[PDB]
């Protein structure tokens, strides 16, 4: 497998500027940044992406400078998206794994829309054991209780709302705080009640410290949410926990 000469050339020019800002022009720095950004994205951020091809670029980046490795792995497009954002979004976990193995990932870095790579896992279905273990490693590198800039939602709230049981189980295995509240005052359990995800409500209520009396901004508890949403089955589970 050959490396992209346009990418490598643009990385060599970046290596100089990163180490010594008076050793590259700003006209020159501009065109190199843009090329690295374009090429690095195309290399790892498509839904096609070979993990080994990614790996062999990272070693070559690391053999140029540790600071260059950092800068490239965490370079963001106009949407604030990095290779980790896209690879998590595309559920390409072997590429995710190779990125995490770099040692320089930023798993909490929020994009422009306000979401980090940990939060983007809420749309992945975990099929293989290596996908579970990559997601768990991803979770343990960052703050799983972090709140998105839009509405203050957690990774857990997002995963509950899309009904991703495997992502909820992974989150709760890393001791995610079930009682975090978003800007409306909503908990993950309240999300479970609105969407009628019975099993997921069961998984949250299995957490002993889960606080069912928390109220949102309008004074609704999870039981109130459930009852208003016509979720008899979920509302019943709450009654059991109340008795």
């Amino acid at each position: 497998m050959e490396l992209s000469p346009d990418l490598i050339s643009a990385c060599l020019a970046l290596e100089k500027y990163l180490d010594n800002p008076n050793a590259l022009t700003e006209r020159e720095l501009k065109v190199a940044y843009t090329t690295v950004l374009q090429e690095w994205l195309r290399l790892a951020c498509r839904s096609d992406a070979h993990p080994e091809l990614v790996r062999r670029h990272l070693v070559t980046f690391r053999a140029m400078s540790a600071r260059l490795l950092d800068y490239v792995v965490n370079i963001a497009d106009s949407n604030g998206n990095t290779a980790l954002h896209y690879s998590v979004s595309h559920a390409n976990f072997p590429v995710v794994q190779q990125l995490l193995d770099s040692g320089v990932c930023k798993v909490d870095k929020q994009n422009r829309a306000g979401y980090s790579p940990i939060m983007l896992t809420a749309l992945a279905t975990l099929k293989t054991q290596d996908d579970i273990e990559t997601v768990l490693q991803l979770f343990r590198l960052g703050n799983i209780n972090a709140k998105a800039s839009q509405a203050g939602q957690t990774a857990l709230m997002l995963a509950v709302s899309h009904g991703r049981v495997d992502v909820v189980k992974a989150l709760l295995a890393c001791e995610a705080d079930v009682n975090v509240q978003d800007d409306d005052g909503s908990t993950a359990l309240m999300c479970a009640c609105e969407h009628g995800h019975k099993e997921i409500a069961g998984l949250l209520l299995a957490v002993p410290s889960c606080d069912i009396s928390l109220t949102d901004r309008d004074g609704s508890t999870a039981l109130m949410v459930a009852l208003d949403a016509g979720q008899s089955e979920i509302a019943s589970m709450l009654y059991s926990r109340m008795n």
Binding site: N79, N81, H85, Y86, S89, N111, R112, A113, G114, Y115, M119, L120, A122, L123, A151, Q153, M157, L158, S161, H162, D182, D183, D184, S186, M190, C191, E194, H195, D216, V225
Partner: peptide, 15 residues
């Protein structure tokens, strides 16, 4: 309320 929203792939990636 955000707890009733069902967010898409595109909404989480692009503002």
């Amino acid at each position: 309320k955000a707890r009733r929203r069902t967010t898409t792939q595109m909404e989480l990636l692009y503002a």
